[model samples]
Target: SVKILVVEDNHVNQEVIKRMLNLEGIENIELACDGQEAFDKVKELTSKGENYNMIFMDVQMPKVDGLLSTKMIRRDLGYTSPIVALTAFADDSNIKECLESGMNGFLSKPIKRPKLKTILTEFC
Candidate 1:
């Protein structure tokens, strides 16, 4: 079984992402509303000897954006697992920011059904 963490602020996006993961046969999942929460959750979970197989981090969030969170996780926490971006922007420079921020890759908002499964295997 895989532990998946989803960091998103919008309730609608959360529900949609949850339902999408369910369709992918994924069950062990956690949610964080913003980047700050995401960072804290990752820190707490890791300190507790728990690790997520993959992380889906939203780009736009209040109180510590995704980029900053990713940087913190990579630099401070020293987490090396794949962190995928959950974003609406898939343009070139936007993607460059994601990678530079330490994400392995990104999926566009309202991600395609199979793409969830794709990211799962591709990263974790």
Candidate 2:
């Protein structure tokens, strides 16, 4: 089973994503409430010998932003897990920033079954 870490602050959004992943038969999942939590989760998981195959990181988060988290996870922690940005703000502004910040790809908000499956299949 493939492990996927989902970092999202919104409760509803997290549930939605979980439901979506379940539909895809991806049951090995981990959830993080905020950016710092996400970072810590990844670090803790790896240090504990549990490696995640992919991560769905929310771009906007309180305390620590996803971009900073990504940089920290990639450079500081030396994690090579593919990170896909989960965002509602898929406009020109954030899209560039998300990609430049080290995200492998993105899954736009209001992401349906097809879109989620497609993006994850293509990238992760």
Candidate 3:
């Protein structure tokens, strides 16, 4: 009985996470097209005394990237919930940037069910 938020700009990418989560026993999922959209949803839900169990944030976005978005959620709204980065840049050099930017963790692109499951277990 947990809610998950996926903030992705791509069409198939958005569907990908939702489907994966559903397959992973996570059906109550929400989608956002960008960082600001995710931020708005989080803010609104918080006002109602509710929040997502986890957030999957895409790294490369048009306007507000996942990095900035994470920072926004952390600094602006004080949202301390788990926010994991969905990115292709999972290397050591790049990984540090996302972690320092306020993301709780990261999942590499072409995400597999195994790692996804681990993430759910750890953060969800």
Candidate 4:
């Protein structure tokens, strides 16, 4: 059913991503305010036998940045779900870091519907 979790601090970005996903008929979606919340949610959901198919994580946040969260998710949590980096900074170095941090892919902001659809098709 294409279950997804969007972890972003900005309310506008959250709404934009969620709105696009909703238009694409993705109803099984959830949100986390920051990387820490996202990390906790992953643990909580997986423990409850409810794992998300994909995770879209923002790079910069208040607590526990996305890279750290990705590391924790892959290392500590042992999560293998596709974790895509959603960031305003799509510079080569940042992209490389995101990949090294265990993210499956990268999506630049402000996210476009066509690109989002492409990602959905590729991942989900």
Q: Quick one: best lDDT, which candidate?
A: 4
Please give, for residues 30-70, the per-residue lDDT of candidate 4 as tens digits. 99988889999899877888799999999888888899989
lDDT of 2 at 74: 94
Query: Distance (Å) between predicted and true CA of 98, model 2?
Result: 0.8
- Regions of model 2 farther than 4 Å from truth: none
TM-score of every candidate relative to the true structure: 0.94, 0.93, 0.96, 0.95
lDDT of 3 by residue, 1-124 (tens): 7999999999898887788888988888999989888889998888987689899999888778898888888998979999999888778978888888989888999877789999999998
Model 1 Cα shift for residue 12 (angstroms): 1.1
Runs off by more than 4 Å, candidate 1? none
**CA-only RMSD, every prediction:** 1.0, 1.2, 0.9, 0.9
Query: How many angstroms is residue 9 displaced in model 3 relative to the true structure, after the best TM-score fit?
Result: 0.9
Model 2: pairs clashing at backbone N, Cα or C within 3 Å: none
Pick out the ten consecutive residues of candidate 2 with the lowest summed lDDT. 104-113
Worst 10 residues of 1 by lDDT: 112-121
lDDT of 2 by residue, 35-105 (tens): 88988988888788768889898888998878888999998798987998988888888788998999988
Cα-based lDDT for every prediction:
0.87, 0.86, 0.88, 0.90
**For residues 1-124, could you state the per-residue lDDT of candidate 1 as single tens digits?**
6888999888888888888898788888899999889998899877976788889999889998899999999988978889999888889989998998899989998877778778877887
